[PDB]
Coordinates of C-alpha atoms and ligand atoms in Angstrom, one line a residue:
Chain E
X1 CA 37.3 -56.3 -22.6
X2 CA 35.3 -58.6 -20.3
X3 CA 36.9 -59.3 -17.0
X4 CA 36.1 -62.8 -16.1
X5 CA 36.0 -63.7 -12.4
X6 CA 36.6 -60.0 -11.4
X7 CA 34.1 -58.7 -8.8
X8 CA 34.2 -54.9 -8.4
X9 CA 32.3 -52.9 -5.8
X10 CA 30.3 -49.9 -7.3
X11 CA 28.6 -46.9 -5.6
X12 CA 26.7 -44.8 -8.1
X13 CA 26.1 -42.1 -5.5
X14 CA 29.8 -41.6 -4.8
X15 CA 30.8 -41.6 -8.5
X16 CA 32.8 -38.5 -9.4
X17 CA 31.9 -39.0 -13.0
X18 CA 28.6 -37.4 -12.2
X19 CA 30.2 -34.3 -10.6
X20 CA 32.4 -34.0 -13.6
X21 CA 29.5 -34.4 -16.0
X22 CA 27.5 -31.8 -14.2
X23 CA 30.3 -29.2 -14.2
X24 CA 31.1 -29.9 -17.9
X25 CA 27.5 -29.4 -18.9
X26 CA 27.1 -26.2 -16.9
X27 CA 30.4 -24.9 -18.2
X28 CA 29.6 -25.7 -21.8
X29 CA 26.1 -24.0 -21.4
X30 CA 27.7 -20.8 -20.1
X31 CA 30.4 -20.8 -22.8
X32 CA 27.6 -21.2 -25.4
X33 CA 25.5 -18.4 -24.1
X34 CA 28.3 -16.0 -23.2
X35 CA 29.1 -14.7 -26.8
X36 CA 25.4 -13.9 -27.5
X37 CA 23.1 -10.9 -27.6
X38 CA 22.2 -9.4 -24.2
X39 CA 18.7 -8.2 -23.7
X40 CA 19.4 -5.5 -21.2
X41 CA 18.0 -2.8 -23.6
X42 CA 14.6 -4.6 -23.4
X43 CA 14.2 -4.1 -19.6
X44 CA 11.5 -1.5 -20.1
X45 CA 7.8 -1.4 -19.2
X46 CA 5.5 -3.2 -21.6
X47 CA 1.9 -2.1 -22.5
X48 CA 0.1 -5.6 -22.6
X49 CA -3.4 -6.4 -23.6
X50 CA -5.3 -9.6 -24.2
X51 CA -4.5 -11.5 -27.4
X52 CA -7.2 -10.8 -30.0
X53 CA -7.1 -14.2 -31.7
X54 CA -9.4 -17.1 -30.8
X55 CA -8.4 -18.2 -27.2
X56 CA -9.5 -21.6 -25.9
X57 CA -10.8 -22.1 -22.4
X58 CA -7.4 -23.1 -21.1
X59 CA -5.4 -20.2 -22.7
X60 CA -7.3 -17.3 -21.2
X61 CA -4.6 -14.9 -19.9
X62 CA -1.8 -17.3 -20.6
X63 CA -0.5 -15.3 -23.6
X64 CA -0.5 -11.4 -23.9
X65 CA 0.0 -9.0 -26.7
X66 CA 2.6 -6.6 -25.4
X67 CA 4.2 -3.5 -27.0
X68 CA 7.3 -1.5 -26.0
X69 CA 9.8 1.1 -27.2
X70 CA 13.0 -0.7 -28.1
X71 CA 16.4 0.6 -29.2
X72 CA 17.5 0.3 -32.8
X73 CA 20.9 0.1 -34.7
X74 CA 21.5 3.7 -33.7
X75 CA 21.8 4.9 -30.2
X76 CA 19.5 8.0 -30.8
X77 CA 16.6 6.2 -32.4
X78 CA 13.7 4.2 -30.8
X79 CA 11.2 1.8 -32.5
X80 CA 7.8 0.6 -31.3
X81 CA 7.8 -3.3 -31.2
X82 CA 4.9 -5.6 -30.7
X83 CA 5.4 -9.1 -29.5
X84 CA 3.5 -11.9 -27.8
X85 CA 4.8 -13.0 -24.3
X86 CA 3.7 -15.8 -22.1
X87 CA 2.2 -14.7 -18.8
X88 CA 5.0 -16.7 -17.1
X89 CA 7.6 -14.3 -18.7
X90 CA 6.1 -11.0 -17.5
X91 CA 5.0 -9.6 -14.2
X92 CA 2.7 -6.7 -13.3
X93 CA 4.3 -3.3 -12.9
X94 CA 2.7 0.1 -12.3
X95 CA 3.9 2.9 -14.5
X96 CA 2.8 5.7 -17.0
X97 CA 1.6 3.9 -20.1
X98 CA 2.7 0.4 -19.2
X99 CA 1.4 -2.7 -17.5
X100 CA 4.1 -5.4 -17.2
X101 CA 7.8 -5.8 -17.2
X102 CA 10.0 -9.0 -17.9
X103 CA 10.2 -11.2 -14.9
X104 CA 14.0 -11.4 -14.7
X105 CA 14.9 -7.7 -15.2
Chain T
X1 CA -0.8 32.4 -14.8
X2 CA -1.9 29.1 -16.2
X3 CA -5.0 29.3 -18.3
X4 CA -7.2 26.6 -20.0
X5 CA -10.3 27.6 -22.1
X6 CA -12.6 25.2 -23.7
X7 CA -14.9 26.0 -26.7
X8 CA -16.9 24.1 -29.2
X9 CA -19.8 23.0 -27.1
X10 CA -23.5 23.1 -27.7
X11 CA -26.5 20.9 -28.5
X12 CA -26.0 17.9 -30.8
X13 CA -28.6 15.2 -31.7
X14 CA -28.0 11.6 -30.6
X15 CA -25.8 9.8 -33.1
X16 CA -24.1 12.9 -34.3
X17 CA -20.6 14.2 -33.7
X18 CA -19.0 17.2 -32.0
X19 CA -15.4 18.4 -31.5
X20 CA -14.3 20.3 -28.4
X21 CA -11.1 22.4 -28.3
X22 CA -9.1 23.5 -25.3
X23 CA -6.7 26.3 -25.7
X24 CA -3.9 26.5 -23.1
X25 CA -1.6 29.3 -22.2
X26 CA 1.0 30.2 -19.4
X27 CA 3.1 27.0 -19.7
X28 CA 4.8 25.0 -22.4
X29 CA 2.0 22.8 -23.8
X30 CA 4.4 20.1 -25.1
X31 CA 5.7 19.4 -21.5
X32 CA 2.5 18.3 -19.8
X33 CA 0.0 15.4 -20.0
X34 CA -3.5 16.5 -21.0
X35 CA -6.7 15.0 -19.5
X36 CA -10.4 15.3 -20.2
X37 CA -12.9 14.9 -17.3
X38 CA -16.7 15.2 -17.7
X39 CA -19.5 15.9 -15.2
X40 CA -23.1 14.9 -16.2
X41 CA -25.7 17.2 -14.7
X42 CA -26.6 15.9 -11.2
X43 CA -23.6 13.6 -11.2
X44 CA -20.0 13.7 -9.8
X45 CA -16.8 13.9 -11.9
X46 CA -16.1 11.3 -14.5
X47 CA -12.7 10.8 -15.9
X48 CA -12.7 10.5 -19.7
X49 CA -9.3 10.3 -21.3
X50 CA -5.7 11.2 -21.3
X51 CA -3.2 12.0 -24.2
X52 CA 0.6 12.1 -23.7
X53 CA 2.8 15.1 -24.6
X54 CA 3.8 13.6 -28.0
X55 CA 0.3 12.2 -28.8
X56 CA 1.8 8.8 -29.1
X57 CA 0.2 7.2 -26.0
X58 CA -3.6 7.6 -25.6
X59 CA -5.8 5.9 -23.0
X60 CA -9.5 6.2 -22.6
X61 CA -11.9 5.2 -19.8
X62 CA -13.9 2.0 -20.7
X63 CA -17.1 4.1 -20.5
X64 CA -16.0 6.3 -23.4
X65 CA -13.9 4.0 -25.6
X66 CA -14.7 4.1 -29.3
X67 CA -17.1 7.1 -29.1
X68 CA -14.4 9.5 -28.1
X69 CA -11.0 10.3 -29.7
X70 CA -8.5 12.6 -28.1
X71 CA -5.9 14.5 -30.0
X72 CA -3.6 17.5 -29.5
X73 CA -1.5 20.0 -31.5
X74 CA 1.6 21.3 -29.5
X75 CA 2.5 23.8 -32.1
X76 CA -0.9 25.5 -31.8
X77 CA -1.0 24.9 -27.9
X78 CA -4.4 23.2 -28.2
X79 CA -6.0 20.0 -27.2
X80 CA -9.0 18.5 -29.2
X81 CA -11.6 15.9 -28.3
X82 CA -13.7 14.4 -31.1
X83 CA -17.0 12.8 -30.0
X84 CA -18.9 10.3 -32.2
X85 CA -22.0 8.4 -31.8
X86 CA -23.1 10.5 -28.8
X87 CA -25.6 8.9 -26.4
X88 CA -28.0 10.7 -24.1
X89 CA -25.8 9.6 -21.2
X90 CA -23.0 11.7 -22.7
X91 CA -24.6 15.1 -21.8
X92 CA -22.1 16.7 -19.5
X93 CA -19.8 19.7 -18.8
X94 CA -16.4 18.7 -20.2
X95 CA -13.2 20.1 -18.6
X96 CA -9.7 19.9 -19.9
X97 CA -6.8 19.7 -17.4
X98 CA -3.0 19.8 -17.3
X99 CA -1.4 16.6 -15.9
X100 CA 2.1 16.0 -14.5
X101 CA 5.3 17.3 -16.0
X102 CA 6.9 14.8 -18.4
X103 CA 10.5 15.4 -19.5
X104 CA 12.7 13.5 -22.0
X105 CA 16.3 13.9 -21.0
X106 CA 18.1 13.9 -24.3
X107 CA 21.6 14.1 -22.9
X108 CA 20.9 11.2 -20.6
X109 CA 20.3 8.6 -23.4
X110 CA 16.8 9.9 -23.9
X111 CA 15.8 9.0 -20.3
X112 CA 12.2 9.6 -19.1
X113 CA 11.3 11.7 -16.1
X114 CA 7.9 12.4 -14.7
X115 CA 6.6 14.5 -11.8
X116 CA 3.0 14.0 -10.8
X117 CA 0.8 16.8 -9.5
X118 CA -2.7 15.3 -9.9
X119 CA -4.9 17.1 -12.4
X120 CA -3.2 20.5 -11.5
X121 CA -5.0 23.4 -13.2
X122 CA -8.5 23.0 -14.6
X123 CA -10.3 24.9 -17.4
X124 CA -13.5 26.9 -17.4
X125 CA -15.7 24.1 -18.8
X126 CA -17.6 23.6 -22.0
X127 CA -21.2 22.1 -21.9
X128 CA -22.2 19.3 -24.4
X129 CA -25.8 18.5 -24.6
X130 CA -27.0 15.3 -26.4
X131 CA -30.8 15.4 -26.9
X132 CA -33.5 15.6 -29.5
Chain R
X1 CA -11.5 -3.2 -11.3
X2 CA -10.6 -0.5 -8.8
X3 CA -13.5 1.7 -7.4
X4 CA -13.7 4.5 -4.8
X5 CA -16.4 4.9 -2.1
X6 CA -17.0 7.7 0.5
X7 CA -19.1 7.1 3.6
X8 CA -19.9 10.8 4.8
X9 CA -21.9 11.7 1.7
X10 CA -23.6 14.6 3.8
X11 CA -21.3 16.3 6.4
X12 CA -22.7 19.6 7.7
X13 CA -20.1 21.3 9.9
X14 CA -20.4 24.3 12.2
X15 CA -18.4 27.1 10.5
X16 CA -15.0 27.6 12.0
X17 CA -14.7 24.0 13.5
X18 CA -12.7 21.0 12.2
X19 CA -14.2 18.3 10.0
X20 CA -12.9 15.4 8.0
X21 CA -14.0 13.4 4.9
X22 CA -13.1 9.8 4.7
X23 CA -12.5 7.6 1.5
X24 CA -11.9 4.0 0.9
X25 CA -10.4 2.1 -2.1
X26 CA -11.4 -1.3 -3.1
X27 CA -7.8 -2.1 -3.8
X28 CA -4.4 -0.8 -2.5
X29 CA -3.2 2.3 -4.0
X30 CA 0.5 1.9 -3.0
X31 CA 3.1 1.9 -5.8
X32 CA 5.6 -0.8 -5.0
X33 CA 8.1 0.8 -7.4
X34 CA 8.8 3.8 -5.0
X35 CA 6.6 3.2 -1.9
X36 CA 4.4 6.2 -2.6
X37 CA 0.6 6.1 -2.5
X38 CA -1.2 8.0 -5.2
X39 CA -4.6 9.6 -4.4
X40 CA -5.9 13.1 -5.1
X41 CA -8.5 15.2 -3.3
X42 CA -10.5 17.8 -5.4
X43 CA -13.2 20.4 -4.4
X44 CA -15.8 21.6 -6.8
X45 CA -17.4 24.9 -5.5
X46 CA -20.9 25.6 -6.8
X47 CA -20.8 27.2 -10.2
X48 CA -17.1 26.5 -10.6
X49 CA -14.9 23.9 -12.2
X50 CA -13.2 21.6 -9.6
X51 CA -9.9 22.7 -8.2
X52 CA -7.0 20.5 -6.9
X53 CA -6.6 20.4 -3.1
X54 CA -4.3 17.5 -2.3
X55 CA -2.0 15.5 -4.6
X56 CA -0.8 12.1 -3.4
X57 CA -1.9 11.0 0.0
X58 CA -0.5 14.0 2.0
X59 CA 1.2 16.5 -0.4
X60 CA -0.7 19.9 -0.3
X61 CA -1.1 21.6 -3.7
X62 CA 0.2 25.1 -4.1
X63 CA -2.3 27.8 -3.4
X64 CA -4.3 25.5 -1.0
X65 CA -4.7 26.8 2.7
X66 CA -2.6 24.9 5.2
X67 CA -5.8 23.9 7.0
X68 CA -6.2 21.1 4.4
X69 CA -4.3 17.9 5.2
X70 CA -4.5 14.4 3.8
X71 CA -3.5 11.1 5.6
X72 CA -4.2 7.5 5.2
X73 CA -3.2 3.8 4.8
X74 CA -3.0 2.0 1.5
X75 CA -6.7 1.7 1.4
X76 CA -8.1 3.9 4.1
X77 CA -7.8 7.7 3.6
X78 CA -9.0 10.8 5.3
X79 CA -8.9 14.5 4.3
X80 CA -8.9 16.7 7.4
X81 CA -9.7 20.5 7.7
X82 CA -8.7 22.1 10.9
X83 CA -11.5 24.7 10.4
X84 CA -14.1 24.8 7.7
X85 CA -15.3 28.3 6.5
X86 CA -17.8 29.1 3.8
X87 CA -14.9 29.3 1.3
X88 CA -14.1 25.6 2.2
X89 CA -17.4 23.9 1.4
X90 CA -18.8 22.4 -1.8
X91 CA -18.5 18.9 -3.3
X92 CA -15.4 17.0 -2.5
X93 CA -14.1 14.2 -4.7
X94 CA -11.6 11.3 -4.0
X95 CA -9.7 10.4 -7.1
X96 CA -7.5 7.3 -7.3
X97 CA -4.0 7.7 -9.0
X98 CA -2.1 4.4 -8.9
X99 CA -3.0 2.7 -12.2
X100 CA -3.3 4.9 -15.2
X101 CA -7.1 4.4 -15.6
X102 CA -8.0 7.1 -13.2
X103 CA -11.5 7.2 -11.6
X104 CA -13.4 9.3 -9.1
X105 CA -15.5 8.3 -6.2
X106 CA -19.1 9.3 -5.6
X107 CA -18.0 12.4 -3.8
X108 CA -19.3 14.1 -0.6
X109 CA -21.1 17.3 0.1
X110 CA -19.4 19.5 2.7
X111 CA -21.6 22.4 3.9
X112 CA -22.2 24.9 6.7
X113 CA -24.7 24.2 9.5
Chain U
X1 CA 40.3 23.7 -51.4
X2 CA 39.3 20.4 -53.0
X3 CA 40.8 19.2 -56.3
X4 CA 38.7 17.7 -59.1
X5 CA 39.2 14.1 -58.1
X6 CA 38.3 14.8 -54.4
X7 CA 34.9 16.4 -54.9
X8 CA 32.5 14.5 -52.6
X9 CA 35.2 12.1 -51.4
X10 CA 35.5 13.6 -47.9
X11 CA 32.6 14.9 -45.8
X12 CA 32.5 17.3 -42.8
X13 CA 30.1 15.5 -40.4
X14 CA 28.8 16.7 -37.1
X15 CA 27.2 14.6 -34.5
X16 CA 26.1 14.4 -30.8
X17 CA 28.9 12.4 -29.1
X18 CA 28.8 11.0 -25.6
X19 CA 31.2 12.2 -23.0
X20 CA 32.8 10.7 -19.8
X21 CA 29.6 11.6 -17.9
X22 CA 26.4 9.5 -18.8
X23 CA 24.0 12.5 -18.6
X24 CA 26.0 14.9 -20.8
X25 CA 26.7 15.0 -24.6
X26 CA 29.3 17.0 -26.6
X27 CA 28.5 18.3 -30.1
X28 CA 31.5 17.4 -32.2
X29 CA 32.5 17.2 -35.8
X30 CA 35.0 15.3 -37.9
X31 CA 36.1 14.6 -41.4
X32 CA 34.9 11.2 -42.7
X33 CA 35.6 9.5 -46.1
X34 CA 32.6 8.8 -48.2
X35 CA 33.4 5.1 -47.9
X36 CA 33.0 5.3 -44.1
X37 CA 29.4 6.6 -44.1
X38 CA 26.2 5.9 -45.9
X39 CA 23.1 8.0 -46.6
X40 CA 20.3 8.0 -44.0
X41 CA 16.9 9.8 -43.9
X42 CA 16.1 11.7 -40.6
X43 CA 14.8 14.9 -39.3
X44 CA 18.2 16.3 -38.3
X45 CA 20.8 13.9 -39.7
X46 CA 21.6 12.4 -43.1
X47 CA 24.3 9.8 -42.7
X48 CA 25.4 6.9 -40.5
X49 CA 28.5 4.9 -40.1
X50 CA 28.6 2.1 -42.7
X51 CA 29.1 -0.7 -40.2
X52 CA 26.6 0.2 -37.5
Chain N
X1 CA 26.9 17.2 14.1
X2 CA 30.5 17.5 12.7
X3 CA 33.5 18.3 14.9
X4 CA 36.1 20.9 13.7
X5 CA 38.5 18.0 12.6
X6 CA 35.9 16.7 10.1
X7 CA 34.7 20.0 8.5
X8 CA 34.6 19.5 4.8
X9 CA 35.5 15.8 4.9
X10 CA 32.0 14.5 4.1
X11 CA 29.4 15.8 1.6
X12 CA 25.7 14.9 1.1
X13 CA 25.7 14.3 -2.7
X14 CA 22.4 14.1 -4.8
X15 CA 22.5 12.5 -8.2
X16 CA 20.4 10.7 -10.7
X17 CA 21.3 7.0 -10.7
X18 CA 20.3 4.4 -13.2
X19 CA 17.7 1.8 -12.2
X20 CA 16.3 -1.5 -13.3
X21 CA 14.6 0.0 -16.4
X22 CA 16.6 1.5 -19.2
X23 CA 14.5 4.6 -19.6
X24 CA 13.9 5.4 -15.9
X25 CA 16.1 7.2 -13.4
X26 CA 16.3 7.0 -9.6
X27 CA 17.0 10.2 -7.7
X28 CA 19.3 9.2 -4.8
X29 CA 21.4 10.9 -2.1
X30 CA 24.6 9.4 -0.7
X31 CA 27.5 10.6 1.6
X32 CA 30.9 10.7 0.0
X33 CA 34.2 11.4 1.4
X34 CA 35.9 14.6 0.1
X35 CA 38.9 12.7 -1.3
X36 CA 36.5 10.9 -3.7
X37 CA 34.9 14.2 -4.9
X38 CA 36.5 16.5 -7.6
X39 CA 35.0 19.9 -8.4
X40 CA 33.3 20.7 -11.7
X41 CA 31.7 24.0 -12.7
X42 CA 28.8 22.8 -14.8
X43 CA 25.4 24.7 -14.4
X44 CA 23.4 22.4 -12.0
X45 CA 25.9 19.8 -10.5
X46 CA 28.9 20.7 -8.4
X47 CA 31.3 17.8 -8.3
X48 CA 32.1 14.5 -10.2
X49 CA 33.8 11.3 -8.9
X50 CA 37.6 11.4 -9.1
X51 CA 38.0 8.4 -11.4
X52 CA 35.3 9.1 -14.0
Ligands
LIG201 C1 8.3 4.8 -29.5 O1 9.0 5.2 -30.7 C2 8.1 5.7 -31.7 C3 9.1 5.9 -32.8 O2 10.0 6.9 -32.5 C4 7.3 7.0 -31.3 O3 6.5 7.2 -32.4 C5 6.5 8.6 -32.7 O4 5.3 9.3 -32.1 C6 5.3 10.6 -32.4 C7 3.9 11.0 -31.6 O5 2.9 10.2 -32.1 C8 5.2 10.9 -33.9 O6 5.2 12.3 -34.1 C9 4.2 12.6 -35.1 O7 4.5 12.2 -36.3 C10 3.6 12.5 -37.4 C11 4.1 12.0 -38.7 O8 3.3 12.4 -39.8 C12 3.4 14.1 -37.4 O9 2.5 14.4 -38.4 C13 2.9 14.5 -36.1 O10 2.7 15.9 -36.1 C14 1.3 16.2 -35.6 O11 1.2 16.2 -34.3 C15 2.0 17.1 -33.5 C16 1.7 16.9 -32.1 O12 2.0 18.1 -31.4 C17 1.8 18.5 -34.0 O13 2.8 19.4 -33.5 C18 1.8 18.6 -35.6 O14 1.4 19.9 -36.0 C19 0.9 17.6 -36.2 O15 -0.4 17.8 -35.8 C20 -1.2 17.0 -36.7 O16 -1.7 15.8 -36.1 C21 -2.5 16.0 -34.9 C22 -2.7 14.6 -34.3 O17 -3.0 14.7 -33.0 C23 -3.7 16.8 -35.1 O18 -4.4 17.2 -34.0 C24 -3.4 18.1 -35.8 O19 -4.5 18.9 -36.3 C25 -2.4 17.9 -37.1 O20 -3.2 17.2 -38.1 C26 4.0 14.2 -35.0 O21 5.2 14.8 -35.4 C27 6.4 10.3 -34.5 O22 6.4 10.4 -36.0 C28 6.4 8.8 -34.2 N1 7.6 8.2 -34.9 C29 7.6 7.4 -36.0 C30 8.9 7.0 -36.4 O23 6.5 7.1 -36.6 C31 6.5 6.6 -30.1 O24 5.8 7.7 -29.6 C32 7.5 6.1 -28.9 N2 6.8 5.7 -27.8 C33 7.0 6.2 -26.5 C34 6.2 5.6 -25.4 O25 7.9 7.0 -26.2
LIG202 C1 22.5 17.3 -31.5 O1 21.4 17.2 -30.6 C2 20.7 18.5 -30.6 C3 19.6 18.3 -29.5 O2 18.8 17.2 -29.9 C4 20.1 18.9 -31.9 O3 19.5 20.1 -31.8 C5 18.5 20.3 -32.8 O4 19.0 21.3 -33.8 C6 18.1 21.5 -34.8 C7 18.8 22.4 -35.8 O5 18.0 22.6 -36.9 C8 16.9 22.3 -34.2 O6 15.9 22.5 -35.2 C9 15.5 23.9 -35.2 O7 14.6 24.1 -34.1 C10 14.1 25.4 -33.9 C11 13.3 25.4 -32.6 O8 12.8 26.7 -32.4 C12 13.2 25.7 -35.2 O9 12.8 27.0 -35.2 C13 14.1 25.5 -36.4 O10 13.4 25.8 -37.6 C14 14.7 24.1 -36.5 O11 13.7 23.1 -36.6 C15 16.3 21.4 -33.1 O12 15.1 21.9 -32.5 C16 17.3 21.0 -32.1 N1 16.8 20.0 -31.2 C17 16.5 20.2 -29.9 C18 15.9 19.0 -29.2 O13 16.7 21.2 -29.3 C19 21.3 18.9 -32.9 O14 20.9 19.2 -34.2 C20 22.0 17.5 -32.9 N2 23.1 17.6 -33.8 C21 23.3 16.7 -34.8 C22 24.5 16.9 -35.7 O15 22.6 15.7 -35.1
LIG203 C1 -1.4 -7.0 -31.0 O1 -1.7 -5.6 -31.1 C2 -1.2 -5.0 -32.3 C3 -1.7 -3.5 -32.1 O2 -3.1 -3.4 -32.0 C4 -2.0 -5.6 -33.5 O3 -1.3 -5.0 -34.7 C5 -2.3 -4.3 -35.5 O4 -3.3 -5.2 -35.9 C6 -4.3 -4.6 -36.8 C7 -5.3 -5.5 -37.0 O5 -6.0 -5.9 -35.9 C8 -3.6 -4.0 -38.0 O6 -4.5 -3.3 -38.8 C9 -2.6 -3.0 -37.5 O7 -1.8 -2.5 -38.6 C10 -1.6 -3.7 -36.6 N1 -0.6 -2.8 -36.2 C11 0.8 -3.1 -35.9 C12 1.6 -1.9 -35.4 O8 1.2 -4.2 -36.1 C13 -1.7 -7.1 -33.5 O9 -2.3 -7.7 -34.6 C14 -2.0 -7.7 -32.1 N2 -1.9 -9.1 -32.2 C15 -2.7 -10.0 -31.8 C16 -2.3 -11.4 -31.9 O10 -3.8 -9.7 -31.3
LIG204 C1 18.3 14.9 -11.6 O1 17.2 14.9 -12.4 C2 16.3 15.9 -12.2 C3 15.2 15.7 -13.3 O2 15.8 15.7 -14.5 C4 16.9 17.3 -12.2 O3 16.0 18.2 -11.8 C5 15.4 19.0 -12.9 O4 16.4 20.0 -13.2 C6 16.0 20.9 -14.3 C7 17.1 21.7 -14.6 O5 16.7 22.6 -15.7 C8 14.7 21.6 -13.8 O6 14.2 22.5 -14.8 C9 13.6 20.6 -13.4 O7 12.5 21.3 -13.0 C10 14.1 19.7 -12.4 N1 13.2 18.7 -12.2 C11 12.1 18.8 -11.3 C12 11.2 17.6 -11.1 O8 11.9 19.8 -10.6 C13 18.1 17.4 -11.3 O9 18.7 18.6 -11.4 C14 19.0 16.2 -11.7 N2 20.2 16.3 -10.8 C15 21.4 15.9 -11.2 C16 22.4 16.0 -10.0 O10 21.7 15.5 -12.3
LIG205 C1 -8.2 -10.8 -20.5 O1 -8.4 -12.2 -20.1 C2 -8.6 -12.4 -18.8 C3 -8.8 -13.9 -18.5 O2 -9.0 -14.1 -17.1 C4 -9.8 -11.6 -18.3 O3 -10.0 -11.6 -16.9 C5 -9.6 -10.1 -18.6 O4 -10.8 -9.4 -18.2 C6 -9.5 -10.0 -20.1 N1 -9.2 -8.6 -20.5 C7 -9.6 -8.0 -21.6 C8 -9.3 -6.6 -21.7 O5 -10.3 -8.6 -22.5
LIG206 C1 29.1 18.6 -52.6 O1 29.9 18.1 -53.7 C2 29.3 17.3 -54.6 C3 30.3 16.8 -55.6 O2 29.7 16.0 -56.5 C4 28.1 18.1 -55.2 O3 27.4 17.3 -56.1 C5 27.2 18.6 -54.2 O4 26.2 19.4 -54.7 C6 28.0 19.5 -53.1 N1 27.1 19.9 -52.1 C7 27.2 21.0 -51.4 C8 26.1 21.3 -50.3 O5 28.0 21.9 -51.7
LIG207 C1 30.9 23.5 3.7 O1 32.2 23.1 3.8 C2 33.2 24.0 3.3 C3 34.5 23.3 3.5 O2 35.5 24.1 2.8 C4 33.0 25.4 3.9 O3 34.0 26.2 3.4 C5 31.7 25.8 3.8 O4 31.6 27.1 4.4 C6 30.7 24.9 4.3 N1 29.3 25.4 4.1 C7 28.3 25.4 5.0 C8 27.0 25.9 4.5 O5 28.4 25.0 6.1

């Protein structure tokens, strides 16, 4: 409904709709991720080497071929898993038979 | 009384192959890391390679990758090193050593413990000569 | 990428007097996971396989006389012997032990004047 | 003493159970129905719980 | 230096704590009050926490 002859003072930086939108987006984000698989069993050292595929000049060291001993469906078993991680997702670590670990662990 | 005795050395022509065997006694073989170190005549000590207790994790020095393969048999309490494509630069006395103590704690969710002691006990040494 | 060097390649010492062998790493050998520095000292007597003297920067190996003592910073290390006898001379080697790819330095020859 | 219609219906299964302490395990056994477990191939074990 | 009134009230307890990595363990020492410690026989350990 257009309001003819109605002048209203606005202030976009004092608008509480922004604060509500912010809180609603964060809350929905957390609600979405809460009932999901946690990766705490993967906070182990990784044995990482250079990717053996053809690497362009700008991808040298960006992506690494990492391997680790992950848990399985059963508590008493382990499996060796190979995966490619971006350098940004791993950090150097000194260990016996490993080179890197996940940045957030 | 920790003992390590190497055998299987001798003279091999360049391009051939030779397998050394280190027999250990006085300790549980399956509980310790095993290392090979070599010393070329007139040179200092050169680290060659290490094999984990289970044999699942193997690492070689860049200078010996490809040409050397390390393996072990815990039931027989013995360590093997298979040499291929030997170069004249590979003439050396080879020694096997015991590494640190590695333990898998089964009760503690198969946790890993490791105590380092350097290269601990060293063997007698076996000479490998590469010449023709 | 990590190498070891030793300045005193020839260090004759009067028997019964103290001596020390220095060693420098091209990179820090400190392990940030536990704060320990991993560096071993070995001695190869003529005609014998090398034996372990010191494990880690300052931990003496069992069976080693108490005269041998290691010390050092993350990159600058020294092995001191309070008195050197004929039984304590031969070729010494500095071995790095932080990263798994272990290497040895050029070594030094300790002898009796 | 198992009757003709119960042969293989119930199994006596042993396993390494956890305990109230993280670093200790208890060897236990229990009777499971065949419908609760499925065959597994391993070095020391031969069944697992059907839903795991 | 413990006075007579505090004998047995504090103990220096060693244990293997978990750490950031799933398959690593951190050996630690801590001082616990006697009221928080309950005896256990075991083989290696001496006590557990009262609520475990
Ligand atoms: C991550 O998890 C995976 C999965 O659990 C782990 O992989 C396991 O690794 C071990 C060690 O490599 C492996 O065990 C071997 O399995 C072989 C299957 O055929 C066996 O044949 C082998 O036995 C040989 O080696 C033993 C070593 O002592 C000897 O006792 C035995 O007599 C055998 O010896 C033969 O082989 C050796 C080779 O060196 C040779 O010298 C001898 O002459 C002889 O020929 C082992 O039992 C498991 O099978 C692997 N598991 C799976 C499912 O494949 C991996 O190690 C884990 N990683 C980490 C970091 O923990
Ligand atoms: C619960 O866990 C324990 C520990 O992992 C298991 O113990 C294992 O039991 C088997 C029984 O056959 C042992 O195998 C035997 O080992 C001896 C070793 O000398 C060998 O001579 C025999 O021929 C046979 O292979 C096995 O070694 C033992 N494992 C360990 C690590 O000690 C137990 O079986 C598990 N229980 C269940 C129900 O899964
Ligand atoms: C990452 O490394 C693994 C291990 O080397 C590679 O997987 C092996 O690849 C070879 C071929 O190069 C196969 O013969 C093996 O069977 C593979 N092994 C396993 C366990 O998968 C993997 O290809 C590498 N990936 C990249 C992109 O380099
Ligand atoms: C904490 O863990 C260490 C390592 O597992 C335990 O010390 C080991 O105990 C066993 C007992 O059989 C000895 O054989 C090992 O030699 C010990 N390790 C070392 C490196 O010497 C220690 O007992 C554990 N402590 C607690 C309180 O759980
Ligand atoms: C991996 O790539 C980086 C790129 O900078 C290079 O420095 C490194 O030596 C390479 N390593 C191997 C093992 O190829
Ligand atoms: C267990 O009972 C089943 C019943 O069909 C039989 O086939 C099997 O051989 C029996 N096994 C043992 C070990 O007695
Ligand atoms: C430790 O404290 C207890 C408290 O009951 C005491 O009985 C014991 O003698 C004390 N031990 C030592 C070694 O001081």
